[PDB]
Design a protein around this ligand. Structure first.
Ligand SMILES: Nc1nc2c(ncn2[C@@H]2O[C@H](COP(=O)(O)OP(=O)(O)OP(=O)(O)O)[C@@H](O)[C@H]2O)c(=O)[nH]1
Ligand SMILES: Nc1nc2c(ncn2[C@@H]2O[C@H](COP(=O)(O)OP(=O)(O)OP(=O)(O)O)[C@@H](O)[C@H]2O)c(=O)[nH]1
Ligand SMILES: Nc1nc2c(ncn2[C@@H]2O[C@H](COP(=O)(O)OP(=O)(O)O)[C@@H](O)[C@H]2O)c(=O)[nH]1
Ligand SMILES: Nc1nc2c(ncn2[C@@H]2O[C@H](COP(=O)(O)OP(=O)(O)O)[C@@H](O)[C@H]2O)c(=O)[nH]1
Lengths: 791, 777
């Protein structure tokens, strides 16, 4: 009949601008999954029952009654459709590690934005296992294990949700936590790239464009070293060649952030470290330090300590249970023999209760000797400083406050070959200084870490840097010029891709921001834009401007969008960063991109880590539930859309018969062709055409969150024929795709079936979203897909 | 704000609207019974992987009461999730019977499929299984009823010819569902009260055509009461001689359900095959049927399907034999009788009618038989005089055929002359009307089963059953008079089922901006639909009436129900509430099996809010302890007399004896006891903002459950799967009166917390005052 208002499926009454807002809102909950591995199936079943009956959590048990790749396929195909349902989902995995390994299950979990718990080692009465199981029921529908990462150090404290003393509330800073998660994942991705490209460990250095403090920690957590690139040097305003002897004067609650601050910076300066007063050095256990050599001096050191430290960090650890001999000015003393003709830095955390000032006289005289050696490239020495008397020092680059010592009096000195050749430190300056430092707030003390970070900063124009050697760079806002910036950034990226460099690029997505503004989600108050020029502002009222970019602009410059989900899942085997709890609308406005050469080299075979599985079904299923679209009816609508499209190209209806089912979109009756800038699309008599359904649903999802569509399109281009699985990868990572008897990934679609889907994409979006879609989002996707399939 | 749980940023009037919208989807469940577990596993995998449907299989690896408890406690939390749920039941009928599984399905607003008799390669079984995958998230079996006759046609969703679309009139279909359920509830009432079959008659207040069909589907006879009788404008003593102008066999159903309303004994002339009768429940009726094509098998199949006593005669009826001893009419001596004459002939039809007319003019006047009504087809080209003609009517489903229906009756015109020209011109006009206007002429037939009278004045002796529909909420009835009428019905132990707009639910829907004044406006309790009086739960409980939801009525009535189901829930229908008399609630409903329970409402709104607002499971109970702390402070209870625990098992512990003043108390708390407040009361207060509420029926049951209570011996114990049972096999006690009234006392602050102060104080107020009456001292 006439009005669609009294017909189903119904888009006209169910999808208005407020439905679109609601889909945006629901996307903040799009990470419901917990993957929990344990070796006791009766225990799994008990907690599965407890959490589903008490909170409605959906529960699955992969117990080995079914072959593992089939059980994964069944379980995660179901889950993929449900990720926007706003209900928790838990998969218990109780098969052996030899059936599905820790690393494979963690990859799958993170590919579905889930938290991951591995406890299969544990006995049935293990207090930790029972604790984590009971936590499922206490916290559901939330969980206190982070998603997509083992650790979290933000303000959220799940135990506060259970305390009457806090009114059973805790902090929740989604954007800040997600931004930190993102910095972590980008670092992890570069770590994975180094590993995949077999870069020598001493060349695992990444350039961060723009000073970004968290990267020091994230890089050392991943065993790579950071260096910042700044266009200009703000004046430290102190004495010494560099102004770091007394210069003028995100959330991360790490337990011993004090010792982490110095040590992660010092581990940047050199792969070889002399550490005096090392015991216990428990904060080092969290880092990845393959390729580092740590010579540790302390009377408390045991054989047990050394072995634990090398096991946990991977560094070469020579632990000697002695006091250091600061009286012997010989390179042959203190075992410094191994550091001959090598770069070395020294972390001195020794101190004495009585005669401290004169203890500092013996060490400083040792460090002044050691700092100008010639058989050892001595790079930097860190020493505690508390001088009540006046003393002159040689080769002193930086006399610095402690950013995490919180109103204490002790200071830190840094010896360097190019520090001041002579300088007398008086005690009234330092007392009046540390008085100023004691006065400043907690936040202000921490931020003096900038002064330590100057020493691992480079001035220069990032757009002019040398990109040879597969150089790794992380770049977003600061990657820009003062002049002609957008054009210069895209040329730089295009050049970087041509050079086979690894410049990782992020930017606000123009058409997603414009869409979120148009439907009324983002206000002019918070973010404005004219064309691709965007003005941001926080409640503080500080404004900054930056350019939005689109997928087709980047592809034209040789760059392919990848999601944060894909980066962390791809990097799962080396990842040692933080996870997250909530998704953030603000973060979802940004897209991240990697150069085309690396996608072609390493990502054309779509295992689950590089797949769109966690986006390709959940928006479609949400809309079908809201709009009353039966499963088979959905495929009928696809057929009707293709019928209308072919008629608009004056294809005569006798050359094809519409089927509109899940297996056949239409059947070709007689030979015809459709003009297309990537074609013509050719259709042969007596064949079935089945268009690419993933293209259609990814085009919807690209309205709301960062899109895997370009990476998918390159994979789809590769999958015109069967492709043998890579021998170096666990076959289980391909569970979600069809595999032939020969062990090959089975072909997906012809180029016709893909480009036909691209051609009807706009009308599909208009149908599913009741003409409240974005033609611009569709158009940039369509243009990029046509470049992928360029003729 | 940057804290969780978070109601301040998550719940605004727009969230409230979205909750109303999600309530249209609150019937996601399918219960599918079959005998083949590998088939069940295959389609479970197919529908969950393709559409995300949540699937459960009850296969007997776990004892049945525990499996049901586990499965449906889980499902109760998910009913507002806007995702399909399928429970496959593969245990034998001996483990859980068809009627029990159907009662459970419908108590959870589900569709129900019973196919456990089928073999693994049954084409019907596979067909219904594949339908799950094709239609998901929808399904083409109706919820809460076997049949459906509305305009929604699921096959059309699959056809390119229709553009893969079909009709969807949620409000009209749910109103028709409602009529059907109200009828089946009265049929359940008649059965529980063992009313004799001859007395199973219900009065419908206000003319409402569909009730004739729903009543005969349940073996009940309808009677309409209307305050004023508009004369139809035609000839004869009642104006029914030429008055001024879905189901595959609605033609035959329309006349026959009406004719079956007039007498328990029927002479059916020309009855074969009468397939449409097989769908009615006709226990208590006797049908004498004449047709040559009648066989013994047709007779047996007819009595088996309907429960009627069928005498099938394989002859032509003899219109030439003018004695009560002929045509076997002897079985009807000293009883009522009506006659349905479906015969016709294509040669000499006029003379055949002439002879039949002579026969019926004699028959209507018999004295050894009380002949109530005779119907005959009428197509005459000659002028002809007629005696005892009560009505001469078009066939409302006659499309454009030229045949009429004559109705003989002892109170018809003693003699009248029917002019063929007049009837011809009447048929000219009728066949040229639109189909809708044609159908609406069935009101002339229903005139003959309508009584004029003020319903508020009617006699209510003998447990009389009345369906007031919405009619008594019309503003021409002062609230004062209706409530005294209802109060008198309850005291007289009558069964008047009463419906009315719920004043406070409607005001809330308007306040939040769901309903516009362009559609509905209200001043206090006077409501104008674009007019009725709204009623509230506290007004009606004072008049002896208890709210019951439509879900509970159909689940309670499930073993006699033979009505229609529905597919969509409807915002408009949910604005209304239904009420039954307290005396029946106390007699038959205080033991809460699953049919009379709030299980399908008490979890799904709370879980939905907790998901939106980031409320952990344990944190929810901490909030409840915090609310109780504040309440006790506000009553100047010294905080050293209690310690807040705020957990699922203890709300607080009592340290020293203390008391709280209360109009139903005082509430007494003994030292060294744990107090656990009634969580169901709090959840139902939320649900009552959005849909009709089981709160008052629940409260009566809760009052009964201060102590353990033995299970009713003549009910399948599996209907009690969802409540705790004691070692000795009793229903375990629920809560003390202190624990219930404490909940009522904090109810307002709980709704303000859960809905970010966008709740309705009036809805909470009417519930709290009714609960206090339930617990009155
Ligand atoms: N991973 C992946 N596999 C595909 C893709 N397209 C086709 N295939 C293979 O072909 C099958 C289905 O193709 P499609 O017609 O796009 O169907 P779909 O993946 O179920 O998506 P819908 O068509 O919307 O139902 C899958 O089982 C794949 O193994 C694709 O885009 N990505
Ligand atoms: N079968 C049944 N049992 C009830 C009902 N109301 C209360 N109970 C019983 O009383 C016990 C405590 O009830 P409540 O505290 O009111 O509610 P609850 O089911 O525990 O749910 P929450 O307290 O909200 O978490 C329950 O575990 C039930 O066994 C009811 O309506 N039906
Ligand atoms: N492990 C665990 N299970 C629970 C907890 N609370 C409830 N459950 C499970 O959830 C089921 C449902 O109980 P529920 O409906 O919440 O009743 P209630 O416990 O009295 O509030 C129970 O049978 C328990 O198995 C809990 O705190 N821990
Ligand atoms: N029985 C049945 N199963 C289906 C149908 N469509 C999909 N499925 C099942 O659902 C599973 C998931 O299907 P889908 O998500 O479309 O992926 P794909 O069919 O493998 O490309 C498949 O293993 C199918 O067997 C259908 O029309 N009937």
């Amino acid at each position: 009949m006439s009005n669609p208002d009294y017909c189903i499926p119904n888009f006209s009454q169910t999808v208005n601008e407020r439905t679109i807002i609601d889909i945006f809102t629901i996307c903040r909950y799009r990470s419901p999954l917990v993957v929990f591995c344990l070796s006791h199936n009766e225990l799994a079943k008990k907690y599965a029952q407890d959490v589903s009956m008490s909170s409605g959590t959906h529960v699955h048990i992969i117990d080995g009654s079914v072959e593992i790749t089939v059980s994964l396929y069944r379980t995660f195909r179901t889950i993929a459709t449900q990720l926007l349902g706003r209900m928790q989902i838990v998969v218990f995995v109780t098969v052996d590690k030899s059936v599905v390994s820790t690393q494979v299950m963690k990859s799958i979990a993170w590919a579905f934005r889930g938290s991951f718990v591995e406890l299969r080692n544990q006995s049935v009465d293990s207090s930790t296992l029972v604790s984590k199981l009971e936590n499922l029921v206490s916290f559901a529908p939330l969980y206190n294990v982070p998603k997509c990462g083992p650790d979290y150090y933000g303000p959220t404290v799940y135990s506060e949700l259970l305390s009457l003393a806090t009114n059973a509330r805790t902090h929740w800073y989604a954007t800040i936590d997600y931004s930190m998660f993102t910095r972590s994942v980008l670092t992890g991705f570069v770590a994975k790239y180094f590993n995949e490209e077999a870069v020598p460990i001493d060349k695992r250095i990444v350039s961060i464009v723009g000073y970004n403090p968290p990267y020091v920690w994230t890089c050392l957590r991943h065993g790579i070293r950071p260096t910042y690139i700044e266009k200009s040097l703000p004046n430290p305003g102190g004495k010494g060649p560099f102004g770091l002897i007394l210069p003028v004067i995100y959330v991360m609650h790490n337990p011993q952030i004090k010792l982490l601050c110095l040590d992660t910076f010092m581990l940047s300066t050199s792969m070889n470290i002399l550490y005096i007063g090392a015991y216990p050095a428990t904060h080092l256990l969290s880092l990845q330090l393959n390729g580092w050599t740590i010579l540790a001096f302390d009377p408390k050191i045991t054989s047990d300590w050394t072995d634990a430290m090398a096991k946990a960090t991977g560094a070469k650890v020579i632990g000697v249970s002695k006091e250091f001999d600061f009286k012997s000015f010989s390179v042959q003393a203190n075992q410094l023999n191994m550091f001959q003709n090598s770069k070395l830095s020294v972390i001195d955390d020794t101190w004495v209760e009585t005669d401290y000032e004169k203890f500092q006289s013996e060490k400083q005289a040792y460090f002044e000797w050691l700092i100008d050696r010639t058989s050892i490239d001595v790079r930097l020495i860190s020493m505690k400083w508390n001088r009540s008397k006046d003393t002159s020092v040689s080769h002193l680059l930086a006399l610095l406050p402690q950013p995490y010592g919180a109103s204490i009096r002790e200071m830190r000195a840094f010896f360097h070959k190019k520090g001041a050749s002579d300088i007398k430190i008086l005690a009234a300056e330092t007392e009046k200084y540390m008085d100023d430092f004691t006065a400043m707030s907690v936040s202000d003390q921490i931020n003096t870490q900038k002064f330590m970070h100057c020493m691992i900063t480079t001035v220069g124009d990032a757009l002019k840097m040398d990109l040879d050697g597969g150089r790794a760079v992380i770049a977003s806002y600061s990657l820009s010029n003062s002049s002609n910036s957008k054009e210069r950034v895209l040329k730089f990226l295009s050049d970087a891709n041509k050079a086979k460099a690894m410049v990782v690029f992020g930017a606000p997505n123009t058409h997603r921001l414009a869409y979120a503004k148009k439907v009324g989600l983002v206000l002019d108050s918070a973010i404005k834009m004219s064309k691709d020029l965007i003005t941001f502002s926080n409640p503080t009222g500080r404004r900054w401007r930056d350019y939005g970019y689109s997928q087709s602009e980047l592809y034209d410059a040789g760059y392919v969008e990848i999601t944060i989900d894909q980066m962390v899942a791809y990097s799962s085997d080396v990842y040692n960063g933080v996870g997250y709890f909530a998704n953030s609308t603000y973060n979802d406005l940004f897209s991240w991109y990697i150069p085309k050469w690396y996608v072609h080299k390493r990502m054309l075979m779509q295992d689950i880590r590089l797949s769109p599985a966690a986006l390709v079904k959940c928006f479609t299923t949400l809309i079908r539930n809201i709009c009353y679209v039966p499963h088979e009816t959905y495929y009928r609508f696809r057929g009707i859309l293709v019928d209308k499209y072919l008629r608009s190209k004056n294809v005569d209806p006798s050359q094809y018969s519409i089927v509109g089912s899940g297996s056949k979109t239409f059947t070709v009756l007689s030979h015809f062709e459709v003009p297309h800038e990537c074609g013509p699309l050719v259709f042969e008599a007596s064949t079935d055409v089945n268009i690419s359904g993933h293209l259609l649903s990814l085009a919807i999802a690209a309205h709301f969150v960062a899109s895997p569509m370009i990476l998918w399109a390159e994979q789809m281009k590769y999958m015109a024929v069967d492709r043998m699985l890579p021998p170096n990868l666990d076959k289980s990572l391909f569970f979600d795709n069809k595999v032939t008897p020969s062990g090959a990934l089975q072909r997906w679609h012809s180029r016709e079936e893909v480009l036909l889907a691209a051609e009807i994409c706009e009308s599909y979006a208009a149908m599913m979203l009741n003409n409240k879609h974005s033609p611009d989002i569709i158009g940039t996707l369509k243009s990029a897909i046509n470049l992928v399939f360029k003729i």
